[PDB]
Design a protein around this ligand. Structure first.
Ligand SMILES: Nc1ccn([C@H]2CC[C@@H](COP(=O)(O)OP(=O)(O)OP(=O)(O)O)O2)c(=O)n1
Ligand SMILES: [Mg+2]
Ligand SMILES: [Mg+2]
Ligand code: NA
Ligand code: NA
Length: 326
DNA sequence: CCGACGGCGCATCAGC
DNA sequence: GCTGATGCGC
DNA sequence: GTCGG
């Protein structure tokens, strides 16, 4: 907060473009812009001044201006009155529900938490579990709770296989005071860039979190990526914790540093980082960094021994996690 | 003025 | 069934 | 919507 009023607006605008407009570049434009301005250590006084930031542009600057002058932005207000827009916006807040579902659902008359609650049969497993946890999904997990769950997945994993190694990523890793969700990066000897790779691995751990009731519901699950719900065990007579999204990604043991870099994000930060890499003649993914130039065809992965080596290749000072919001 | 925008997992559907 | 696309997601 | 060619 400094320029919260600004970032908010951009955020709203970005939500619009993405849910309603289905103009994903404009969505990306708005968020980068909001993240840069969020790091900005001064209270912006004008658009021009914002313009000096990378990602802030001419339009966004006129807006910031009407904004600073009126405390508002018409276009937002006016969007705010559109009904089709409010439904989509509402619907898209349901996990599993995105731009196209929300429009067909709107088209078919489903448009409120009510319409939804009586039409579970028209949803997919995904959206049904999302409907189910609708407000919980919207709550911030505070840090002390994060410390509790970590402890659990960790302790649980050890139990399945001493060898497994799980690490809590996303906003947590970035030292946040409250996450949004739980992101678990996991590895095991047995599965490497050239392994006879075991689907047993993600499975047995998922299983183990189940039997312990940590894990309550499943959103998706492949042989390397699991996406579901978990929850902390409540004390006698104490009212239970909300349900949380938890993501567990299984990574080749060996491509760990690329793995952790990726899962720690931010998403904006990675977006920015991967881009700079291209610039620099590279192409970074969760597995490897590879040379990629002129012909556009990439080459063999360069060796890496730390997250650091990935910043090195691209000419960037190491940015510890706390510095990853963008 | 204009092409490109990070890179990839899992679910679902149609084509065959 | 498989392959490719599209949705929605991290 | 912006950026960089
Ligand atoms: N479009 C995205 C979204 C996410 N990720 C990466 C960023 C880190 C990891 C975890 O993602 P989230 O849990 O969505 O984000 P977070 O930074 O952990 O934030 P939150 O507190 O909202 O979970 O996935 C990404 O590369 N690209
Ligand atoms: Mg997260
Ligand atoms: Mg997550
Ligand atoms: Na700018
Ligand atoms: Na959604």
């Amino acid at each position: 907060t400094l320029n919260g009023g600004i970032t908010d607006m951009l955020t709203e605008l970005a939500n619009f473009e993405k849910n309603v407009s289905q103009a994903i570049h404009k969505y990306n434009a708005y968020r980068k812009a909001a993240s840069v301005i969020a790091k900005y250590p001064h209270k912006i006084k004008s658009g021009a001044e914002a313009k000096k930031l990378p990602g802030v542009g001419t339009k966004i600057a006129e807006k910031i201006d009407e904004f600073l002058a009126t405390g508002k932005l018409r276009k937002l207000e006016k969007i705010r009155q559109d009904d089709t827009s409010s439904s989509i916006n509402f619907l898209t807040r349901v996990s599993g529900i995105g731009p196209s579902a929300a429009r067909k659902f709107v088209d078919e008359g489903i448009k409120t938490l009510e319409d939804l609650r009586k039409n579970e049969d028209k949803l997919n497993h995904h959206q049904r579990i999302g409907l189910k946890y609708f407000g919980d999904f919207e709550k911030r997990i505070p840090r002390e709770e994060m410390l509790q769950m970590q402890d659990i997945v960790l302790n649980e994993v050890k139990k399945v296989d001493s060898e497994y190694i799980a690490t809590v990523c996303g906003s947590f890793r970035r030292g946040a005071e409250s996450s949004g969700d739980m992101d678990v990066l996991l590895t095991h000897p047995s599965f490497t860039s050239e392994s006879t790779k075991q689907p047993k691995l993600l499975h047995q751990v998922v299983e183990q979190l189940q039997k312990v009731h940590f894990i309550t519901d499943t959103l998706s699950k492949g042989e390397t990526k699991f996406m579901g719900v978990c929850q902390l065990p409540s004390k006698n007579d104490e009212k239970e914790y909300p349900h949380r999204r938890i993501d567990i990604r299984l990574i080749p043991k060996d491509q760990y540093y690329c793995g952790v870099l990726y899962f720690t994000g931010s998403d904006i930060f990675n977006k920015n980082m991967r881009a700079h890499a291209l610039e620099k003649g590279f192409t970074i993914n969760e597995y490897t960094i590879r040379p990629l130039g002129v012909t556009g065809v990439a080459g063999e992965p360069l060796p890496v021994d730390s997250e650091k080596d990935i910043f090195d290749y691209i000419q960037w000072k190491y940015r510890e996690p706390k510095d990853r919001s963008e």
